[PDB]
Write a protein that binds this ligand. Structure first.
Ligand code: 3PE
Ligand code: NDP
Ligand code: ZMP
Ligand code: LMT
Ligand code: SF4
Lengths: 353, 87, 80, 36, 122, 182
């Protein structure tokens, strides 16, 4: 909000606060920018005049991010989580570095250990190598170093290594995110054959990706957010079945719920993930994620500390599900007697054409 | 036995129809396809060509009722704007 | 006739620009009694209009300045 | 068997296969999104 | 409405009784239309917010005491009504009339002296 | 203090994978995925169907790419009307604020994979009408662009040159070899 920013290292920035052609003077490196969250942090910096370094793995995927900025603002770098030089040279000029990189499943090239540990290691070591001012690590909700979930385990261990080498790390633990192009509402919207093993009984606090994207901007703009952990989540407790009925109440969709017990589902989950090359939405570790419930850290800062209000998901379902609404002239209600009379003032056939 | 079942289907189209004057149009033709089909299968049994011919003339009268039936239904729709039966 | 008052009466109850509830009578005037403005009238009659699912013409809406006038127009309309 | 039977099944196989290349190899985005 | 669905031949108000009659009929049509504007343009606002915001745009010109000024302000309204009721305006033009869908939001002037000073004139 | 027991010794030995541009190719699995790419790229190149927005004069020069002297058909180019049948959008002409919503709508309807060519100064950066109240200063404020062709108007050879640059970009597109690295 101020026109002067003294970075944590000490250099001053004199920003002019406008739009695309302005001077935000922040240089940013967003790791994990081609997913669903990164396009909100990238667009927010770029549309206010800041340079955003966007490391990418695939050329095609990254293309939608350049529209948000003026010439010289979105710089694309070809990077690999196992090539340190690509990481090193992506962060040498950056003021703030973000790390949004994360999978929910193991691959043939990355175990949840490789992604969340060996990448955070490789990346934060570069942040410490160049004395970058702010380093913001997006972790997960329910992150805990000793967890049966490899996702909650390996993402919880990254939080350790982040501050072991960079003590001034912001941690951001977002709840399952929702909105446009998500895997929460769009999953309930799109899939038909759905497999679970805990009766869709997950309870959590769904948060809009858009406040998460806006919140990550404000951690850059407040120097007091440096070195503490945040818990971003929505205002109301929700269960997946309660979330689904909202999707159900808007779109009127019928889906198959199979709900196979945990012993016969998890060993099978690994197999499907090991032979199908796309994200099938169920894997071994993802099923274990079903049994936990979100527990809010009481020692961690929240939206309010950033001057923000979360919104619930009920106020947004109609917006993000309206495109998925098959409504033709067929599905309309039976007509009333008043309008049936109106039809007698028209001829409904053209007998001369 | 298939001929009788398919006759029932046309009958049952009249049993379950409170609103579709189009299904009443349809079931009459299912009933005609039963009777023509029965005539044909008995003609194969008796080595008679007259059963085949009688089927042909049933098919030609059946198409003509469709023209008269869809023509009259057009005349009705032009002044009504609905094929629905209030109930 | 009792219903056409009951549905209108509760409607003005939730209307904010009304100076104070309990001033609504059978003959309440929109300007003098309720203190509603020239553009607060149109807003009210629109609520009057939509609640009974009928479209008020301009030649008739300019006449709706008191509640009793509103009543006598809605009764004259066959649909409701 | 007769020749007419093997012929329809053959065409049926070819018609299915062109579906298979499409459904196997073509990308598949999940997002599939009143007057008289 | 001969050439187009909501066309109105350009007319010059004869006097203040006539000019106020037209203003009220213009306001009536707009606030009548607000449900129809909110579905076509998929406005993520209550119909009440649309109607209260339509009122503001008439509330701006409530103190005009010139009859030649009212007619141009009425013609502007009629033309805006025609391009909104025919689906000619894009959702982008319509929901850009609401001055809170800016990434800076409704708060775009500085509130007082000091807050605009610390931000460099906003 | 230690973050996890394996640290301070595991970091000593780690592998270094060259970036995809400098990546080599070796192995049966690697060749096989590479062949799948080359065939896929051969057909994305051989059949090159552009959807087009002839906004102004540059469209005339795109019409001279279909005439006998320079024929597109001989290289496999067939301009399709529908976005659903198309591969690449060629924005050829001055983009105005009134035209921009329909540009984004048409691009939003292009099935993947998608490429955009910006043809001419007007689409590239506004051109002669850059300092106007009615013109979008560059079509890349609306959609992503892959090739920019210069000139007002580019010659027909120049637009051909731009298509060959794009055809080369596709020949260098790794589809099944990127999925293999991750
Ligand atoms: C021709 C393709 C040849 C592929 C050889 C096997 C490659 C391999 O091991 O791929 C593993 C893959 C599982 O998918 P992965 O990429 O590990 O993670 C993404 C989400 N499942 O599983 C596969 O894609 C292997 C099976 C390929 C055919 C389906
Ligand atoms: N969205 C949610 O519901 C929640 C998500 N989070 C976490 O927030 C972060 C961002 O979320 P979201 O946008 O949904 O994540 P996505 O899965 O949509 O995107 C993750 C990003 O990480 C990159 N990435 C993943 N694995 C690797 C790898 N091995 N090497 C290099 N890059 C990699 C991806 O690039 P590419 O596309 O090329 O793989 C992509 O840009 C993630 O860490 C996520 O787990 C936390 C809690 C809830
Ligand atoms: P009451 O007697 O208190 O007040 C009645 C009036 C207002 C007539 C006054 O008595 C009066 O004389 N005032 C001066 C005359 C006047 O109001 N002039 C202007 C009338 S035209 C006008 O105001 C047009 C406003 C804009 C029209 C469009 C509004 C909606 C556009 C956006 C909709 C939402 C997005 C699609
Ligand atoms: C009729 C004969 C028997 C059937 C033969 C054909 C089988 C077809 C199914 C196997 C191939 C599936 O094809 C593949 O589907 C998946 C899921 O929809 C898509 O996957 C895509 O959407 C899913 C949605 O969950 C994402 O998580 C995934 O990351 C993305 O790539 C692939 O883009 C598509 O290429
Ligand atoms: S770039 Fe030149 S030729 Fe092309 S549309 Fe603009 S003015 Fe016309």
């Amino acid at each position: 909000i101020s026109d002067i920013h003294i970075t944590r290292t000490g250099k001053p920035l004199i920003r002019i606060q406008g739009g695309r052609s302005s001077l935000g003077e922040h240089t940013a490196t967003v790791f994990g920018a081609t997913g669903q969250l990164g396009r909100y942090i990238v667009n927010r910096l770029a549309r206010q005049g800041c340079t955003v370094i966007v490391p990418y793995r695939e050329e095609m995927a990254k293309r939608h991010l350049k529209v948000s900025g003026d010439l010289g603002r979105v710089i694309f770098m070809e990077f690999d989580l196992r090539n340190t030089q690509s990481i090193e040279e992506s962060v040498r000029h950056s003021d703030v570095v973000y790390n949004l990189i994360g999978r929910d499943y193991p691959t043939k090239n990355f175990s949840l250990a490789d992604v969340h540990i060996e990448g955070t290691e490789r990346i934060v070591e570069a942040v410490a190598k160049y004395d970058v001012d702010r380093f913001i690590q997006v972790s997960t909700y329910n992150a805990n170093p000793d967890s049966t979930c490899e996702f909650f385990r390996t993402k919880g261990i990254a939080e350790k290594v982040a501050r072991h080498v960079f003590p001034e790390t912001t941690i951001v633990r977002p709840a399952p995110m929702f909105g446009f192009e998500d895997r929460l509402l769009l999953k309930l919207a799109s899939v038909t054959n759905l497999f679970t093993s805990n009766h869709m009984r997950e309870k959590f606090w769904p948060v809009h990706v858009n406040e998460v994207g806006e919140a990550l901007e404000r951690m850059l703009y407040d120097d007091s957010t440096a070195g503490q952990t945040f818990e971003l989540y929505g205002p109301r407790q929700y269960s997946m079945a309660q979330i689904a009925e909202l999707v159900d109440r808007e779109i009127y969709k019928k889906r198959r719920h199979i709900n196979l017990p945990k012993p016969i589902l998890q060993p099978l989950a690994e197999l499907i993930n090991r032979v199908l090359w796309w994200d099938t939405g169920l894997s071994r570790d993802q099923v274990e994620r079903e049994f936990h419930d979100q527990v809010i850290d009481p020692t961690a800062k929240t939206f309010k500390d950033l001057g923000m209000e979360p919104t619930d998901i009920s106020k947004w379902t109609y917006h993000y599900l309206l495109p998925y609404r098959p409504s033709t002239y067929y599905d309309l209600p039976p007509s009333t007697e008043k309008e049936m009379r109106e039809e007698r003032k028209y001829l409904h056939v053209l007998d001369d054409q | 036995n298939i001929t009788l079942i398919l006759f029932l289907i046309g009958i049952l189209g009249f049993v379950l129809n409170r609103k579709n004057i189009i299904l009443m149009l349809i079931s009459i033709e299912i009933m005609l396809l039963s009777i023509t089909f029965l005539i044909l299968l008995s003609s194969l049994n008796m080595d008679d060509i007259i059963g085949q011919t009688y089927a042909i003339y049933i098919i030609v009268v059946a198409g003509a009722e469709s023209a008269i039936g869809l023509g009259i239904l057009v005349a009705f729709y032009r002044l009504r704007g609905s094929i629905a039966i209030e109930y | 006739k009792v219903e056409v008052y009951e549905r209108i009466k509760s409607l003005l109850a939730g209307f904010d620009k009304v100076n104070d509830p309990n001033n609504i009578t059978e003959t309440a005037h929109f300007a003098n009694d309720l203190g509603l403005d020239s553009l607060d009238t149109v807003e009210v009659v629109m609520a009057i209009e939509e609640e009974f699912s009928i479209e008020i013409p301009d030649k008739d809406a300019d006449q709706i300045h008191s509640v009793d006038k509103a009543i006598e127009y809605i009764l004259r309309q066959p649909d409701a | 068997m007769s020749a007419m039977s093997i012929y329809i099944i053959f065409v049926s196989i070819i018609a299915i296969l062109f579906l298979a290349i499409d459904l196997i190899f073509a990308p598949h985005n999940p997002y599939k999104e009143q007057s008289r | 409405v001969q050439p187009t669905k909501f066309a109105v031949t350009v007319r010059q108000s004869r006097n203040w009784a006539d000019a106020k009659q037209r203003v009220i009929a213009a306001y009536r049509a707009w606030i009548r239309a607000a449900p129809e504007i909110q579905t076509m343009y998929s406005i993520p606002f209550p119909v009440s917010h649309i109607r209260t915001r339509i009122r503001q745009e008439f509330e701006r010109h409530r103190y005009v005491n010139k009859l030649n000024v009212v007619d141009v302000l009425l013609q502007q309204s009629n033309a805006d009504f025609q391009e909104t009721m025919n689906f000619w305006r894009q959702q982008s033009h319509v929901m850009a009339f609401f001055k809170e869908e800016h990434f800076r939001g409704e708060k775009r002037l500085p509130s007082n002296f000091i807050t605009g000073f610390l931000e460099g004139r906003n | 203090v230690e973050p996890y027991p394996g640290y301070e010794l595991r970091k000593s030995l780690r592998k270094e994978v060259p970036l995809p541009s400098q990546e080599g190719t070796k192995g049966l699995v690697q060749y096989a995925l590479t062949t799948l790419d080359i065939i896929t790229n051969w057909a994305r190149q051989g059949s090159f169907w552009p959807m087009t927005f002839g906004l102004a004069c540059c469209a005339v020069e795109m019409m001279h790419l279909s005439t006998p002297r320079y024929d597109q058909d001989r290289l496999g180019i067939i301009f399709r009307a529908s976005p659903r049948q198309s591969d690449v959008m060629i924005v050829a002409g001055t983009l105005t604020n009134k035209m921009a919503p329909a540009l984004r709508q048409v691009y939003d309807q292009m099935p993947d994979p998608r490429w955009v060519i910006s043809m001419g100064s007007c689409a590239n950066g506004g051109g002669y009408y850059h300092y106007s109240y009615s013109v979008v200063r560059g079509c890349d404020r609306i959609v992503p662009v892959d090739v920019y062709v210069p000139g007002c108007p580019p010659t027909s050879e120049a637009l051909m040159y731009g298509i060959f640059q794009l055809q080369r970009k596709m020949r260098n597109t790794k589809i099944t070899r990127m999925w293999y690295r991750k």
